[PDB]
Amino acid sequence: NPIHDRTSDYHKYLKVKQGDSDLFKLTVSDKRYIWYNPDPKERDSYECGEIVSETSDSFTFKTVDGQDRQVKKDDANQRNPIKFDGVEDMSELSYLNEPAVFHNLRVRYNQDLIYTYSGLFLVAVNPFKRIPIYTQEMVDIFKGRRRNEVAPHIFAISDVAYRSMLDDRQNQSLLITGESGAGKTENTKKVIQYLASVAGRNQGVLEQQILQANPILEAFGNAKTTRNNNSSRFGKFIEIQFNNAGFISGASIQSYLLEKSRVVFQSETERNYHIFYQLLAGATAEEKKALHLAGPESFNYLNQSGCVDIKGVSDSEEFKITRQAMDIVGFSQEEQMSIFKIIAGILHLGNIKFEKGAGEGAVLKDKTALNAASTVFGVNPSVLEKALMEPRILAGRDLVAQHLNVEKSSSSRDALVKALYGRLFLWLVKKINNVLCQERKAYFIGVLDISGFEIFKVNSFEQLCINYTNEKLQQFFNHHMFKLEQEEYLKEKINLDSQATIDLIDGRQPPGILALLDEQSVFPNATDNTLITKLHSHFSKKNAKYEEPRFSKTEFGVTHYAGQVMYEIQDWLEKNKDPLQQDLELCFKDSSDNVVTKLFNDPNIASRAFITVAAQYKEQLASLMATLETTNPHFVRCIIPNNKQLPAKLEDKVVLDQLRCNGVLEGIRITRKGFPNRIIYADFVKRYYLLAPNVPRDAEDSQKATDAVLKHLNIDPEQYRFGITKIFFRAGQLARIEEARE
Ligand SMILES: [Mg+2]
Numbered sequence: 001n002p003i004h005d006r007t008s009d010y011h012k013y014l015k016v017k018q019g020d021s022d023l024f025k026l027t028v029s030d031k032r033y034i035w036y037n038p039d040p041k042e043r044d045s046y047e048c049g050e051i052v053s054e055t056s057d058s059f060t061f062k063t064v065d066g067q068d069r070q071v072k073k074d075d076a077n078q079r080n081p082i083k084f085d086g087v088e089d090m091s092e093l094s095y096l097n098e099p100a101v102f103h104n105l106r107v108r109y110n111q112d113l114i115y116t117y118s119g120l121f122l123v124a125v126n127p128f129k130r131i132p133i134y135t136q137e138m139v140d141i142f143k144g145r146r147r148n149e150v151a152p153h154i155f156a157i158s159d160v161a162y163r164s165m166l167d168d169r170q171n172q173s174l175l176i177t178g179e180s181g182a183g184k185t186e187n188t189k190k191v192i193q194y195l196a197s198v199a200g201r202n203q204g205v206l207e208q209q210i211l212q213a214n215p216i217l218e219a220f221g222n223a224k225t226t227r228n229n230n231s232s233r234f235g236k237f238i239e240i241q242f243n244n245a246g247f248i249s250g251a252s253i254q255s256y257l258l259e260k261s262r263v264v265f266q267s268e269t270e271r272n273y274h275i276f277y278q279l280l281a282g283a284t285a286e287e288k289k290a291l292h293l294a295g296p297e298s299f300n301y302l303n304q305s306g307c308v309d310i311k312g313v314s315d316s317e318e319f320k321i322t323r324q325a326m327d328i329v330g331f332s333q334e335e336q337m338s339i340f341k342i343i344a345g346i347l348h349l350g351n352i353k354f355e356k357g358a359g360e361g362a363v364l365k366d367k368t369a370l371n372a373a374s375t376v377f378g379v380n381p382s383v384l385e386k387a388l389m390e391p392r393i394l395a396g397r398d399l400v401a402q403h404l405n406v407e408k409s410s411s412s413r414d415a416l417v418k419a420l421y422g423r424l425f426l427w428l429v430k431k432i433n434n435v436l437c438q439e440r441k442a443y444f445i446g447v448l449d450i451s452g453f454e455i456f457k458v459n460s461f462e463q464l465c466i467n468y469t470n471e472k473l474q475q476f477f478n479h480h481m482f483k484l485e486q487e488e489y490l491k492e493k494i495n496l497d498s499q500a501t502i503d504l505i506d507g508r509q510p511p512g513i514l515a516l517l518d519e520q521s522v523f524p525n526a527t528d529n530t531l532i533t534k535l536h537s538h539f540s541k542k543n544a545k546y547e548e549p550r551f552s553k554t555e556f557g558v559t560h561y562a563g564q565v566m567y568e569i570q571d572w573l574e575k576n577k578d579p580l581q582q583d584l585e586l587c588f589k590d591s592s593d594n595v596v597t598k599l600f601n602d603p604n605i606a607s608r609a610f611i612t613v614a615a616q617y618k619e620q621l622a623s624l625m626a627t628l629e630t631t632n633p634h635f636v637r638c639i640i641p642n643n644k645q646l647p648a649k650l651e652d653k654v655v656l657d658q659l660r661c662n663g664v665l666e667g668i669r670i671t672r673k674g675f676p677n678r679i680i681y682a683d684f685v686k687r688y689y690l691l692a693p694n695v696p697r698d699a700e701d702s703q704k705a706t707d708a709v710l711k712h713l714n715i716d717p718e719q720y721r722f723g724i725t726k727i728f729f730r731a732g733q734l735a736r737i738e739e740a741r742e
Contacts, residue, residue, distance in 0.1 A: 002141050003150065010141055013133050014151035016086040016111060024687060024742060033079040034061050035099030036069065044656040046099040048079060079103070081738045086111070088152050090118040090664075094735030096672040098665060102656055109641070109650050115152035118637075118664050119671060120481055122157050125639045125655070126183040128647035134190055139197045154187045157634050158194040164632055165443050166246045172445045173631040175473060177452040178662060181228040181645060182638035188238070188449040189214060195240050195445065199248045206436075208328055210240070210251045213432050215325040219278060219318070220425055221255070223262060224271035227643070229310050233273070234258040234425070235450030235466075237624060241441040250438030255429050256450065256620065257462060260418040264350065266305040274318065276302055277309075279343050282319025291344040292372045301350035301417075330435050338595035341376040342424050348373030349417050354389070354406040361403030362389045378592035387583035388413055412581055419580050420588075423599040423606065430605070446627070452637075453562040453661050461575045461613075464513070464567055467560055468505050469621050471498055474561045474663055476628060477635060481667060485674075492723030494675070501545050501560055506618055511538065513558075514614040521576045521612055528554065532569045562661035576612045637662045675721055675728035681706050684727055690742045703727075713740055 002008035006018060035046045049061040049069065060070045077097040084093055085107045093100055101118075108116055109125055116123045132138075133153065142155040144163065150156055161172040174191055176184045192211065200207040218230065225231040234255050241250035266272050280288075280296055287293070296302035309315070326336055351369035354362045364370060364385060374381035389409045392401045404412065453470045454463045475498035489495070505513050516534050520526040535556055539546035547557035547564065555568045589600045600606050608616050639658045642651040659665045668676075681702035689695040689705065692712030699705045706727050710720065715737070721728040729737075 002137075003145075009132065010138070010151070013112065013131055014115075014153065016108075016113065024690060027081065027083045027738075028742075029082065034059065034071065035077040035079055035097065035103070036061070036063070036071070038064060042653070044098075044102075044653045046077070046102075046652070078732070078735070081735050083738055084735075086113075088117060090116065090123075090668060091671065091676060094677060094729075094732055094738070096668050096676060096731055098656065098659075101659065101665065101668060102652055105655070106650055106652075113152075115154065117147070117152050119667055120477075120484065120635055121664055121667070122152060122154070122634075122636045123639065123664060124154065124183060124187060124636055125641055125650070126181065128641065128645060134193070136197070139194055142194070143198060154190045154636065155194050157636065158191045159198065161445055161632075161634050162195060162198060162246075165242070165445060168632065169443070171443055171631045173628050173633040174445070174447045174636060175477075175628075175633060176447060176449050176636045176638060177470075177473070178638035179227075179640050179658065180225065180231055180451060182640045184449045184451075184638045185218075185222075185230070185232050187636060187638060188447050191447050192238070192240065196248060199242060199246055201247055206250070207248060209330070209436060210248070212325040212328040213251070213253065213436065215321055216329065216428065216432065217253070217255075219275045219322045220273055220428060221258060223266075223273050224307065224310050226267065226269055227645075229313070230274075232449065233262060235448075235469075237446055237448045237627075239444045239446040241438045242443045242445070244442045250436055250441055252433050252437040253429055254620075254624070255425065257465060257617075258422055258425055259462070260422045263346065263421045264301060264414045264417055268305060269307050270305050271307055271310070272302055272305075274315070275322065275343055276347065277315040278319035278322055279340055281315035282317075282323075283340070287340070291341065291376060292348065293344065299347045299351060301347055329432060331431065335431075335595060338593050339424070339428075341378075341593065342420060342596065342599075345373040345376040346417050346420055348376065349413055352388075352413055354409045354413075356406040359403070360405055362406045362409040364389070377588065377596055379587050379590060379596075383587045383590075387581060387587045388416075391581040391583045412584070415580050416584050419584075420596075420599065424595075426605050427595070427598055427602075446631070448624075448628075452658075453560065453565075455562065455565050455661075459565055459567045460570070461572050463565070464505070464558070465614075465617050467558075467562075467565060468502075468617075469624075471501050471505070471561055472621060472625055474498065475502065476625065476633070477663055480633060481670075485671075488678075492678070492726060492728070494721050494723050494728055497545075498561065501558065504539065504543055504545050504558065514618060517572060517576055517614055518612050521573055526573055528569050528571070528573070531573060532556065535569075561663075576614055578608075578613050637664055672731050674730075676731055677729040677734045678723065678726040679729070679734075680726050685709070688737065688740075691737070691740045713737070 002010040005011065011017070032051045033048045034051055036049050037043055037045060038047050039045065047064045049063050051059045051061045052068065053060045058070050058072050059076055060068060063069055077099045078095040080093055080095050080100055085104065087093065087104060090101055090104060093104060105116055105123065105125065109127070112127060112131055114125050114127045114131065139155060142150060142153065142159045145156070145159060147156060147160055157174065161174060164170065165172050176188050178184055196207045196211060197203070221234045222230050222232050235257055237254040239252045240248065241252070243249045262272060271277065277296060280293055283291065283293055296308040302308060323336065348369050352364070353366070353369070355365055356362045367381070370381050370385060374384050390401045390403050391412070392399050450469065451466055454466050456463065478498065503512055508515055513535060516538065517531065520531050520534060532554060536548040540548035545559040547559070549555055549557065549566070554570060555566050557564050557566045585600055585606070588596060591597050591600065598605065639655060642649045642654050685695060685699055685702055685705040686697060688709050689697045692709040694708045694712060695705050703722065715733070719730050719733045
């Protein structure tokens, strides 16, 4: 019994190590501390100062160096008594100021305890090393245990959700968000691993197919970035389907915002999508030859970042893994071949060199790349050729071929590549769903694995999109926390800005940012300047959450939940329409490839609806929210410990900033205001009995006993509330209590 076996790995890796004794006395201490900023400039950097004296309204303390400093009781960040160091839930803390929250998290992380609850949230901090807590034996310990009966773990919230589903006969959701590198994907895979074990059968085909879908999507959707070697370049909502009996019966995946741009360009040190590298590494000498493949260095779309390999990863071996997953899900070798051929053609398309200066219109002298690409796509090179540099364009009733220059030509080519790529991804997702997805499903548990708020040096359309989704999600949480808190107070018999940001973005009348973008999108000749001027015109000094910059002519600010975000408007018009020359659709529509034809002939893949990329985004987000609203949700906040991808380096600034953005500190702020500590009567007595010359450690009349102690200590009754089963304490009270003499 691992949970009770102090020698188990359960104990070792998931719990604060327990010694012989539990006795209150052990933690007795005379010292009182405060959390302060040694450098008022650096507000997330604190140090602990021992309070030396006080006055009626201030405290005086001793800094790190022996420097006396003084502070206002009302501004003091008291440090919780040592007993509170390491608790499994931040809600168990008596003083809930920020530094206190950070400290508890750090104490845990220093013992490699990466999971901690904060009220409704599970906080998960990437340790940047592999903790062996996800084995099958680990899976087994969580089975059917209540939140309160086992240590914090992704498995634990996954079991709670599964039991809630079976118990309440209600669909569930797990929202796993945070920064790139935080471990969202990793935890999402633990959730699926867990559910397939606790609810799978014949332990099975279905289960292996479900498990095998990820690997497929990661290869086409993930890439090495400067922040994560296996970054998810798309967001996802996975629906895990169960029958009335609680057995897994299916799955469906919805994908969002794939970064198609990466296909054609990658920043220094970054890589293109894994798959490109997998193919080249792993294709068979005979496959290479038939696909006209070479090394990556020979491909414009793969030889620009300087990086083509990932430390400790075998593209060849992963390829194996990827083809294997495909086999298992059920992709026919033929299908597999066309996939690779599409990957191939894309690489060929990127190798096309456009030349000019004949006229002012582009040409192709060498036609090797083109032929290469046409061959693999199964399209007519001459048609491809014309469609690239001489697309026929509607100007009046006049349908006329325009000779584009090398640039436009190049950009068009890039558009083609992006379309193929995104359409292929979409088709792979549908293919997967077909195999996995249930028409008739009884229940589901869905997992969202998407980033939280994004605030980079440069914020663009995709950033607004993701932050727009995050305002919606933060508002969902806030509505939820609010219902739950009330219920609680109710069961124990104890006595917005979101909307405004949301409206500025998605409002229809008056029109918000996306509506004005859609409007401009209809005018072929609109520009970045017309757009941004229109935005400023409607919101500058007119909408409280918008800000026109003092100098930049190309950006605008939005006050988000997480703070102000500055956006740059370049290419939004283009991003919004995501254009592709009709002649290009025509060309490929004739492909002789059984997969390619689908990318262009199926209106479900080839087209958005004519609705804009913003309108589609807004639509998909609303459906998503509609689905979530039907579930009982569970929130996991994944946090990166620093920006360097290193273990054992938990950076206060880095962390605190995330806690600020993701809603964890707000929640505590709100919680701290009422009765943050709610404890089961017996639990209380068991620990504090010895503070009153009355009480029996054990005692049927636990509430009475509680009242004994309280009374004995002369506690201010405004400080607590007797609930039906727990005693409710205001912030700080419990700390003073812990501090009482036996
Ligand atoms: Mg990820």
